[PDB]
């Protein structure tokens, strides 16, 4: 009932046994679960950084995907006497909205936009607090 | 006494939610729950001028439900029938070793914009800054 057989191909466990393995595996599986943690720090944002030759802080760097930028048209369009400087476009913006904040983006993938702000309440200290209980972090109604 | 003290918090929370109260006191009752989530970092500053052993711990176990005898009769008058080795340093190697560090910052720089950046990077103390303008000149 726990595994299929001696060939050892499938397993099937129970809830007090899965809790006990989950409690034992705390020092290696301790991690930040909610998906908003990885905002601008997931695969596609690393792909967009690689493809735009822009560097997220903490993220890896690569060779330029399109190394030839020496070609240049001397046009009046992006002339600074036309441009209003009000907010510096820092490089996190180029990854978060890649078709807006880049001129000429190539080999770029569309990022995931948002996740609902997570309200999960759990405690680690006292096991004897009940499953349904008012959190000291909650607004009192 | 966190178990009993949560139950006081548990009982007090019943009042704000399911009971009508006065207006001006109401924002005082919910302010007490606003500090619970900010965790009391504006109510714990004071004069703990004894060590946790230098104060001999006389935690008196009183209650407000017992008699306390009211001994006001003492405040009236009554009638008693009763080894560091202080080496003076004349070498001034310290001021020589700091003069070499500044002279070398200057001589390793192409421009004076890049020489000032390296001096500003060292973060020299306030009392040494007059000594730095003197080396530059």
């Amino acid at each position: 009932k726990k595994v299929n057989g001696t060939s050892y191909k499938k397993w099937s466990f129970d809830l007090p046994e899965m809790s006990n393995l989950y409690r034992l595996s705390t020092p290696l599986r301790d991690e930040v679960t909610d998906k908003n943690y990885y905002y601008l720090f997931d695969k596609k944002s690393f792909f967009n950084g690689k493809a735009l030759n822009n560097a997220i802080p903490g993220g890896p760097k690569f060779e330029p995907l399109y190394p030839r930028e020496e070609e240049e048209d001397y046009n009046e369009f992006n002339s600074i006497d036309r441009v209003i400087f009000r907010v510096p476009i820092r490089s996190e913006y180029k990854v978060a909205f890649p078709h807006l904040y880049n001129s000429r983006p190539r080999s770029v993938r569309i990022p995931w936009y948002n996740n609902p702000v997570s309200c999960i309440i759990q405690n680690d200290e006292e096991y004897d607090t009940p499953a349904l209980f008012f959190d000291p972090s909650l607004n009192p109604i | 006494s966190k178990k009993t003290h949560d139950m006081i918090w548990e009982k007090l929370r019943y009042i704000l939610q399911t009971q009508e109260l006065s207006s001006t006191l109401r924002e005082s009752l919910e302010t007490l729950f606003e500090i619970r989530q900010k965790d009391y970092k504006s109510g714990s500053q004071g004069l703990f001028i004894l060590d946790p052993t230098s104060y001999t711990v006389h935690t008196h176990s009183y209650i407000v439900s017992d008699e306390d005898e009211a001994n006001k009769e003492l405040g009236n008058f009554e009638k008693c029938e009763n080894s560091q080795l202080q080496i003076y340093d004349m070498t001034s190697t310290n001021d020589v070793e700091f003069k070499k560090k500044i002279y070398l910052v200057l001589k390793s720089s192409l421009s004076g914009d890049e020489a000032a950046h390296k001096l500003l990077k060292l973060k020299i103390a306030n009392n040494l800054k007059k000594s730095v303008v003197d080396i530059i000149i």
Binding site: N54, A55, R90, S91 | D113, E114, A116, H117, L120
Partner: peptide, 27 residues
Amino acid sequence: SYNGIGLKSAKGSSTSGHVQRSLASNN
């Protein structure tokens, strides 16, 4: 952040590519 400053790589360059903001730059 990268902010449009720096080499495209420190591969043909003979340098490490380390960039720092100048403290002598007033703004």
